[PDB]
């Protein structure tokens, strides 16, 4: 465990071996989850990159938050993928927040505290329990077979993952930087492993 | 009766069977009405959709607030239709408020608290009392014959309908989220029926 | 006399018979005047319309505040006309204020409290005393021969006319909605006559 | 002497005989000066006009603040001219402030309190003492030979001229309308002479 | 030593002999540095210019902050150069802040307090101790062989250089104009030498 408050990872060079593995104390497969994180990059107008990858022993794209070039944000669960239109992108640190529910398939997507429309995706699906979380790289296998074109260059931090669906007030509290208590993945009790050219530097965002 | 405060309906998938029927304790035909609601959708730049439909045993488009593609908002009463120009539409939850009066035909249209110009429509007409209110679908019969192209995908809530014309101060109070007391259709005493893939989730708008 | 505070006229339908005559207790011909009013319309991007007409037994366009299509505001006195450039027009209630002086010919034109440049028009001219004030229609005779293309569709109110030139501080007070005391045409002591399809409804502007 | 506070000159008609001569109690030739004034006009997008002319018995353009069409502001001293780029001009009263120093040639140009870059012009030059200051007209002789195309149409006021270089804090105080004490040309002790169609009206700017 | 607070250098004319040499009490070669300065110029849309040059007896571009025409800011260390994209440049005084670290190669670039993305440059390199700092001119030798096309025209000041990497809070304090204590190059204890047409005038920026 490590209290990584006011600190973030740094991926300064485009490569295929720089990544960070996040360990989660999960035993029960998830019927709902909410992933909130913060990242900063300049490749939004050059190519596509991976933000948050989550793969199991059966699917390499179980939970993947991808950025599609000239399209926007790509949120996929269980292989199927929905798109969130982004007309104009700005060069600034952005805070994203994704949520999902199996009983209804509703997917919520929040950008800088402003929520987007609700869409249906994988109603009744069951997300596996054991997985390998990788930040900065998209995995097309179990913890390997990385990708120089789908890799991420920039900063990332404040990664928090719950096991239920957060309310709008709770998401606003997350965005405002208040107090919270994650249970699946906590930025204050992270169990991470660094492999490659990844440095830990103070965050640039307030 | 159900107190649906801080809660809204969810139409996540485009279909023709997802709808919600609103029951109203009306006995006298309306000589004036004021409909205030709140919705959120992304189809404003893709196609047209229905927002608030109100049909009787004689006219399927008695009171219909429609969104015309590349045109704007469409408010029709008794079959005749007037148009409200919308040059640029934004991706954000919007609060609309419509009012009508039979003695003078004046139609008031408010967007996010900002009022539009006053137009004449159906002077002296009489709106029927018994009706079938449907949210998310445009009806071209009495409570049926739905429409995959005129259906609505997104959220909707705060539906309030009076039996008279509201003042500008009252409409500003409605927009500010203060206290009010509807008499024909109250979001705090709604008598609704869900049929299809419609879920009740907390509202995204403040 | 009628106290029409917080109330305005409504011209909802384009026609040639809807108008309102304003009576003024004037006996002396005016050597200077200041006309402040408020209106709201959507025809600024479709065609031209009349705002404030003032005609005598000799000239039908003695004092006329006209809106020229794709040009801007048209202020004419005694037949001669000057133009005020409007590059971009917005769909919103606007408050105009015009002033004139015979001893120097200076014409002041204020839009939403922001003053425009001062221009010369009819130095030494004398405006007649008896006249027929018409709102919503441009007259090309004495109180008649109306015009479906030069008519006005929308709301209008807060019409106040003095017999001298107002100061910038006084015009700012007028725009802020403070206290004042007109002497030629008072919105609080208006002597008006309605003929046609003109309704009196509460104002939309604050 | 005349206290012209909260008052400004008016040039409403384009002509060649409307001008105002400003007398200055100067005896020593100036080694440095600072000219701050305020004007309002609409010809910024039509043609060029003169703002502040200052000529002696040897040079008609000794000190001239000119507006070049589709270029910007033109500040010239002793015949040589430098340019200040203006990409977009707005229709609003603007406050300009120019300063010069002979020992170093530095020229400071302030627009609405925002300073521009410093440029070199006429290092070591000596500005004459006796001169004829003319507002609204550019002179190409000593107090004559005016110019219908280089004339000015609009308002002008708050003309203040010192005999040294003002500091940034002093220029900010000038822009904020605080207290000051000019010595060469004071708007509170102006000694002016009106010849032509020039009227004294209250200022439009706050 | 000289306390140059609220004062800045002036390069008003484009030439090749106007420059200022900054002396630094450095003995140990730098493993990390942070350079914060403030400048103002208008050549951002005309050509390229030099901002902060730092050369030793072996490399003329050891530390150079350059502005590339139609590209943006150019930060180079040890000969290798990285680019920071600038889509739109404005005519206003800007505050830049650069930092570097040899142990990790991370380069931080701050514009007006807003940080940019972190990039890798010269991991493990060692910057020499003795050097010749020149402001306004880019050197392609040791303190000579200047360049009329790479020279700088405008103002510059608040030059501060440390011997370590500053934190985001410290950089925000620098931008806010608070108290600080540099150790390699202090604007309050500068040891500078002027050669050419360079004047010391009060700063324009607040
Ligand atoms: Ca994969
Ligand atoms: Ca892949
Ligand atoms: Ca129908
Ligand atoms: Ca239909
Ligand atoms: Ca006429
Ligand atoms: Ca006519
Ligand atoms: Ca001349
Ligand atoms: Ca000339
Ligand atoms: Ca070099
Ligand atoms: Ca060079």
Numbering used by the authors:
A (entry chain D), B (entry chain C), C (entry chain B), D (entry chain A), E (entry chain E): 1 to 206
Question: How did the manuscript describe this experimental structure?
Answer:
In this study, the effect of physical and chemical factors on the orientations of macromolecules was investigated through an analysis of selected well studied macromolecules, and important parameters that determine the behaviour of proteins on cryo-EM grids were revealed. The test proteins used in the analysis include human C-reactive protein (CRP) pentamer, CRP decamer, human erythrocyte catalase, SARS-CoV-2 spike protein, E. coli PaaZ and E. coli β-galactosidase. We performed a comprehensive examination of how macromolecule orientations respond to alterations in physical factors, such as freezing temperature, and chemical factors, such as the addition of surfactants or the presence of affinity tags, during grid freezing for a standard set of proteins. Hence, electrostatic interactions at the AWI are an important factor in determining protein orientations in the absence of any additive.
CRP exists in a concentration-dependent equilibrium between a pentamer and a decamer of a 25 kDa polypeptide under physiological conditions. In the concentration range used for cryo-EM experiments, both pentamer and decamer populations were observed in the same micrograph and were analysed separately. C5 symmetry was applied to the smaller pentameric molecule and no symmetry was applied to the decamer during image processing. The preferred view for the CRP pentamer is the top/bottom view, where the symmetric arrangement of the monomers can be seen. Some side views are observed, but no tilted side views are seen in the 2D class averages. The negatively charged B-face of CRP in the absence of additive is less sampled in the case of the CRP pentamer and is not sampled at all in the CRP decamer. However, we note that with CRP pentamer, the orientation distributions look similar with both Tween 20 and Tween 80, but only the addition of Tween 20 led to an isotropic map (R = 3.3 Å), while the addition of Tween 80 led to a low-resolution map (R = 7.5 Å). The orientations observed in this case look similar and the resulting reconstructions from 256 289 and 204 354 particles for the pentamer and decamer (C5 and C1 symmetry) resulted in resolutions of 3.2 and 2.8 Å, respectively. In comparison, we have obtained a 3.3 Å resolution map for the pentamer and a 4 Å resolution map for the decamer by averaging 25 000 and 51 000 particles, respectively.
